[PDB]
Point group: D2
Chain length 246, copies 4
């Protein structure tokens, strides 16, 4: 992973959780990381301090990338600030609350797919020419990595149906992007967390516990590094303590 | 399949292609079929004539079910006309044209996902209480069947990314619906066509040719019938001449 | 399914359970069925009486098809008796008892793999030329259908590892056979039961109960019939009450 | 991966190809590696010299682990020599030549499953108590990693049917082992190479070329390291240039 030194990595929803853990872990290899927050309260100085104290650098960016404009805003700021992108990590998403099918309306359906689908489509669309440029300059590969989900495979919980589907949406659009963009030397891969932090849900996990964010980050590092994963595209790595074994 | 006589079957996008072929075949068992057309020119008298000549009955409905209103209209009409519903077949959808990722805008994205995601979510949502009632009265199961795609599994063609992803979305949301609604004795299953109606796309199909709509219809009949598929839910049957073997 | 009248259908492990239920249901369409028993006690006259009373015909054969010789015997008898073969149903198999990994020896390993792998490989191998001939004369397709398992996908129960793996083996070898033999107009498809006939294993099934053999039979009929499934090959239909949703 | 220093890693079929590349890559982190050869000619001094010059250590062992005895022999020698196992890498296997189904006999079927199935079952069986011991001592996890195949998923090429199936056999037995042995803190994961080193087969690979062995090794390192993959079990990582995107 020494190839990560100086690599410019924009990570959505990275102000907390899996995104922040990944940011820090990438920072240990000397990456330059664009941290980003939607609405969750946050402390940019603290967060960028951990990156720097870890051996890296970066900046903080704010955007409600449920909207397309917000998504081109984010990508723009990153690019002004660091003059390009080597790795895009689509990590922003989440439940947007739970509804049974019969209480789902347009608002809800749209909130979920904006947060999970549109965001990723547009975040990735705008990056592409910069991702292309950087692979062309390095003569290696640049990378996209998105956060998928166990729920992509087995339907998710009751009330999370549209969220679950949006992750399947993501798992499959990556496959499409492998066809369009492999000739641009851009890779696409997914990390699919299971349960990450009830005692019933644990029973269903062979390892008997929820994951920590620290346990999720290395898979992203792996997919981020051309040295490690240069012949790997179109894949999903499920990180779940055995909870599902596809 | 004698259990199909008199069953009330709403089929979206059934004015032609797969959906019409299915309608006819169900009509051979004496089903009562709601036929539906969105944009395409059609001849209701001709189409309903085939159903009746096949041994069934039905009616024809018009709706641009890319909109939720349109979707609640359709269901309502069907239910007025036949006083309920034993089977819903979500067959409406399609490419909505092709775009490379970089030319995808909010319009295109939303045109694909409305035709493929929203339609099916809302069509299915409004049906549920009636599906529930019908299973409650029969003491067996009612059914949902949707048209999936080979593209749901392997990414689709170049420019078809959003459409392909929307089919994965559907394949996975069904798994959610099994969790919410199996308690209501409603089943959910998919038929996933491959190539249906170039001469290099044939090379990829072990059977060496595209499918015909007649070859797709029986799989729907199968999923429609409690006698045949009463212990089957949460499944996909791929009908593709060997093109993909999951 | 009227296309099944007179079709000659060899079904392994058909003296009871799923295979016998299938035999009867095929017999309802006027199939001619070769029934087969390995070890279990059985009553040929009773069993063949059911086929005939259902509207079909058949004969009964005895073979311990864990051995290749036994497998060539069975096929030969069937072919003498009915002068050929339109459908082979590989249904013989099963646990052969349970062992934790550490107690597995060459005997146990070989008893499981002979019952589940070798049987199916050789049963199917010896059938091929006749299956080929029958498709050649009909100008349609002949068929192989094998009994898979939920355990093929998710590992099986503790002590059942080798059995579970042998079903994955079968699921995948079918995909190979599609490549070799689609040119011969032979189709290959699987039915994968879940739990079929504790009260916590029910909790894992959305439909809340085990399947019955009657509920498994129709899926075989479906795959047996060129009229129904002529463009379908390389597939698995899982029949499990929602227990797994691939 | 600094956690790999001093870790004792027995790698079957490691005298050449993927196994040797992995051995060397693990040696860069200071692992102690048991190299092993079946029958392929080899140069132990040269091979162990690369490990040592890479920063590691190890030994060389010879065994025709197509036989169970040979498999307990191998495990024994490793264990005498290094006093236990932290990671078992089941990499031995391969085509054993090609046969069409109709020319497959017992010899062939058995040669293939001995090489690909029995070897792995027994290699792993004998390691378990030592794998268990070492996780218990470290209070982390010990690991098994096997070499799977793209052919496990899509049937393999004509003539390689039994080989392809044996890899599916392996992919699924791992799932079983996750159920039996997670409570022993032993992980199980797979690396599934695609094509690794005709110009037709390249056309089917998005990256347009075969993999090199150097490109396969990092995935094994990743699965070998508790630090990197401690919450990861029951998984397959496909390393194939996009050739299949499960």
């Amino acid at each position: 992973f020494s190839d990560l030194k100086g690599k410019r990595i924009l990570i959505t929803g990275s102000s907390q959780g899996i995104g922040m853990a990944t940011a820090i872990e990438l920072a240990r290899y000397g990456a330059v990381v664009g941290l980003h927050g939607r609405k969750a309260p946050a402390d940019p100085a603290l967060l960028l301090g951990k990156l720097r104290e870890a051996g890296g650098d970066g900046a903080f960016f704010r955007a409600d990338i449920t909207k397309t404009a917000e998504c081109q805003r984010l990508v723009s700021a990153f690019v002004e600030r660091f003059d390009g992108i080597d790795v895009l990590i689509n990590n922003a998403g989440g439940l947007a609350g739970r509804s049974n099918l019969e209480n789902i309306d347009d608002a809800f359906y749209d909130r979920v797919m904006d947060l999970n689908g549109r965001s990723v489509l547009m975040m990735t669309k705008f990056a592409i020419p910069h991702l292309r440029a950087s692979a062309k300059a390095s003569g290696t590969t640049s990378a996209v990595i998105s956060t998928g989900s166990i729920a992509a495979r087995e339907g998710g919980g009751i009330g999370a149906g549209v969220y679950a589907a949006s992750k399947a949406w993501l798992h499959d659009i990556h496959r499409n992007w492998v066809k369009e963009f492999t000739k641009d030397s851009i890779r696409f891969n997914i990390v699919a967390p299971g349960t990450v932090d009830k005692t019933r849900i644990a029973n269903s996990i062979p390892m008997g516990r929820f994951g920590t964010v620290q346990e999720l980050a290395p898979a992203y590092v792996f997919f981020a590094s051309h040295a490690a994963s240069g012949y790997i595209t179109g894949q999903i790595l499920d990180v779940n303590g055995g909870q599902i074994c596809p």
